From a paper:
One of the key enzymes within this node is phosphoenolpyruvate carboxykinase (Pck), which catalyzes the interconversion of phosphoenolpyruvate (PEP) and oxaloacetate (OAA) using ATP or GTP as a cofactor and a divalent cation as an activator. Mtb Pck is a GTP-dependent enzyme that under standard conditions catalyzes the gluconeogenic reaction leading to production of PEP. However, under reducing conditions, it favors the anaplerotic OAA synthesis. Like human cytosolic Pck, Mtb Pck consists of two domains: the N-terminal domain containing 337 residues (residues Ile1 to Glu241 and small subdomain comprising residues Val310 to Gln406) and a slightly smaller C-terminal or mononucleotide-binding domain of 264 residues (residues Gly242 to Ala309 and Gly407 to Gly604).
To explore the Mtb GTP binding pocket as a potential site for Pck inhibition, we determined the crystal structures of Mtb Pck in complex with GDP and Mn2+ and with GDP. The final dataset was collected to 1.8 Å resolution for Pck-GDP-Mn2+ and to 2.6 Å resolution for Pck-GDP complex, respectively. Additional disordered region is present between residues Ala448-Asn458, forming flexible loop in the Pck-GDP complex. The differences bigger than 1Å are located within the N-terminal residues Gly8—Thr11 and in residues Arg81, Gly190, and Glu259. The identical interactions were found for GDP in the nucleotide binding sites of both complexes. Furthermore, the aromatic residues Phe502, Phe510, and Phe515 form a pocket with three walls and strongly contribute to GDP binding by π-stacking interactions with the guanine base sandwiched between the side chains of Phe502 and Phe515. It should be mentioned here that the conformation and position of GDP and the mutated residues are the same in both crystal structures. Comparison of Mtb Pck-GDP and Pck-GDP-Mn2 complex structures indicated that binding of Mn2+ does not influence positioning of GDP in the active site during anaplerotic reactions.
Numbering used by the authors: 8 to 450, 458 to 606
């Protein structure tokens, strides 16, 4: 194909050929990450009809893209961990023999890139200055993928450079699975009814076929950053996690970094862009999705965000509820996927301010206030925006040695039973709280271990073991304290006991105070939990009885919880570590 490519990495140069020969594109193109390229690609995408260019008074350099109603997220059921032995995928994952899967996908790939450009998209996960940065190359026939990868990863010339002549990298292959015939006119959003998102842990490879959407197609965002990364983590001494990285800044003038793993729809994005409500506190973000954490030479755990932009859910995002998010998209350079077009070339979505009377919806049809029965924006529609535009981005965001983590937080939605905040008794108890994370639920109480249920690249039980092991072998003075929060406990009339949002900084305050040995906490069966007295309520219009209710550890309710933990633990099967059963036994012993 077109190989006058700017590299002497033979291994790469082979692989590109081998793939081209199988997929039969018209040309191969290597992407460089330049502004100049970005515009070409956006122009080609606007000509194709995939992108609409937004009215540029209102938004610098921003676009709207509408997908086929058939690839719109997801497809965890078409997502596979193809390790050699089935046990090393484990019961949270979909497995298939690797040889059987190669057969299926080599068939699928044969001639799939036909009447289309094959982009070779190199990229770096993590800051770029690192000694041994974690790099990858995504081949894809989708331009939308190229553009989106430019914001979400450090893409192009720089990463290609970091690879040398023989530097290792993750081989990541994508196709939309819609080959053209030589006459044929394309569609705005090519995809297929057949979809596979396949992860090969031992060879550190991702094969994606069939979808052009999100985490099925932008291969760094979950395929690399959690699935392959976690497997790397296992083998190499670190942790790849579904965590926001928050930097909380006290009245003067200390920085505390937190890592928090909530499942999606439970509040990562809010907590990561928290505006504290107590005078003198600031907050800055390093990330709101993925945290890579390693132990420092002395002797702490350091976090880095492997990504380079935000890929947020649009619906419900607004100036009241997330103005930091909003200022970030205002700076433009943004691609909106499946939101609505306003009468004057702007974008809108349910929850945004205004009440436009007419819209063109995400299917391209006319939409009307108090009339059309469907949402104007797709309810999982997205924005894709550079991290560097975020006004509260912490200055250490591009810093390869990371930030020391003081606390690690786990949580989800629980209407009952789980208090607003609980501190772990120790590392091994910490892992068990993570390991047992429950959220209601569905797609009524789902277990979603460290908010990683759909993202583990290997067996859950071994993943827990890995967590225990990194703790056993470290100075417990220097480990992060672990906490378990719940913003969502409800009273008898069904209102929230806790107001949450901004005011969650009160809970973070207690966590800091606890680190600076200056707040109290009762020992309870599930861990240490503050009395209302122990929390800074000054300035808050809320009933102290509500707050104590949020804080209750009720022996009866937790007795009801133990069989659900147990089922879940049985479901984890033969790799369930002793530590976790020990902690389960302990929790049971203290509840009687
Ligand atoms: N009651 C309550 N709801 C919250 C809180 N934080 C987030 N939410 C709700 O959870 C949903 C969005 O959380 P988001 O930050 O988008 O979660 P993410 O999907 O985990 O990033 C919205 O419906 C929010 O209003 C909170 O502290 N209290
Ligand atoms: Mg949930």
């Amino acid at each position: 194909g077109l190989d006058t490519a700017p590299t002497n990495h033979q291994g790469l140069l082979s692989w590109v050929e081998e793939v081209a020969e199988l997929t039969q594109p018209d040309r191969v193109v290597f992407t460089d990450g330049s502004e100049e390229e970005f515009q070409r690609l956006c122009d080609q995408l606007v000509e194709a009809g995939t992108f609409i260019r937004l009215n540029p008074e209102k938004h610098k350099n921003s676009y709207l893209a509408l997908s086929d109603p058939s690839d719109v997220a997801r497809v965890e059921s078409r997502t596979y961990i193809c390790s050699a032995k089935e046990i090393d995928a484990g019961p949270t994952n979909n497995w298939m023999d690797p040889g059987e899967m190669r057969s299926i996908m080599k068939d699928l790939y044969r001639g799939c890139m036909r009447g289309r450009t094959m982009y070779v998209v190199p990229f770096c996960m993590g800051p770029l200055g690192a000694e041994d940065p974690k790099l990858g190359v995504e081949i894809t026939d989708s331009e939308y993928v190229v553009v989106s990868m430019r914001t979400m990863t450090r893409m192009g010339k720089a990463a290609l450079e970091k690879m040398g002549d023989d530097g290792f990298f993750v081989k990541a292959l994508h196709s939309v699975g819609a080959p053209l015939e030589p006459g044929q006119k394309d569609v705005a959003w090519p995809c297929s009814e057949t979809k596979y998102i396949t992860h090969f842990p031992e060879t550190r490879e991702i094969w994606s076929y069939g979808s052009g959407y999100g985490g099925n197609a932008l291969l760094g965002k979950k395929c690399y950053s959690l699935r392959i990364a976690s497997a790397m983590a296992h083998d190499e001494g670190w942790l790849a996690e579904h965590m926001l990285i928050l930097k909380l800044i006290s009245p003067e003038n200390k920085a505390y970094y937190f890592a928090a793993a909530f499942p999606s729809a439970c509040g990562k994005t809010n907590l990561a862009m928290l505006q504290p409500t107590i005078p003198g506190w600031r907050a800055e973000t390093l990330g709101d999705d993925i945290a890579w954490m390693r132990f420092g030479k002395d002797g702490r755990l350091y976090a880095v965000n492997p990504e380079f932009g935000f890929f947020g859910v649009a619906p419900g995002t607004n100036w009241k509820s997330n103005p930091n998010a909003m200022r970030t998209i205002a700076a433009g350079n943004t691609v909106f996927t499946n939101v609505a077009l306003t009468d004057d070339g702007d974008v809108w979505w349910e929850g945004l301010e205004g009440d436009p009377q007419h819209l063109i919806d995400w299917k391209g049809n006319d939409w009307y206030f108090r009339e059309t029965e469907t949402n104007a924006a797709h309810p999982n529609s997205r924005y894709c925006t550079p991290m560097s535009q975020c006004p509260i981005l912490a200055p250490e965001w591009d810093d390869p040695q990371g930030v020391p983590i003081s606390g690690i937080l786990f949580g989800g939605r629980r209407k009952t039973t789980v208090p607003l905040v609980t501190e772990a008794r120790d590392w091994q108890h910490g892992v068990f709280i993570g390991a047992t994370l429950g959220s209601e639920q569905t797609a009524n109480v789902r277990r979603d271990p460290m908010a990683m249920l759909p993202f583990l690249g290997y067996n859950v039980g071994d993943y827990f073991q890995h967590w225990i092991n990194l703790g056993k072998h470290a100075d417990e003075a220097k480990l992060p304290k672990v906490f378990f929060v719940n913003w969502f406990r409800r009273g008898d009339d069904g209102r929230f006991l806790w107001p949450g949002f901004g005011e969650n900084s009160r809970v973070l305050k207690w966590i800091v105070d606890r680190i600076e040995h200056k707040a109290g906490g009762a020992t309870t069966p599930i861990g240490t939990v503050p009395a209302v007295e122990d929390l800074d309520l000054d300035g808050l219009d809320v009933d102290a009885a509500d707050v104590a209710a949020a804080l209750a550890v009720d022996a009866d309710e937790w007795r009801q919880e133990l069989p659900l933990i147990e089922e879940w633990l049985q479901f984890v099967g033969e790799k369930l570590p002793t530590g976790v059963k020990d902690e389960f036994d302990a929790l049971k012993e203290r509840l009687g």
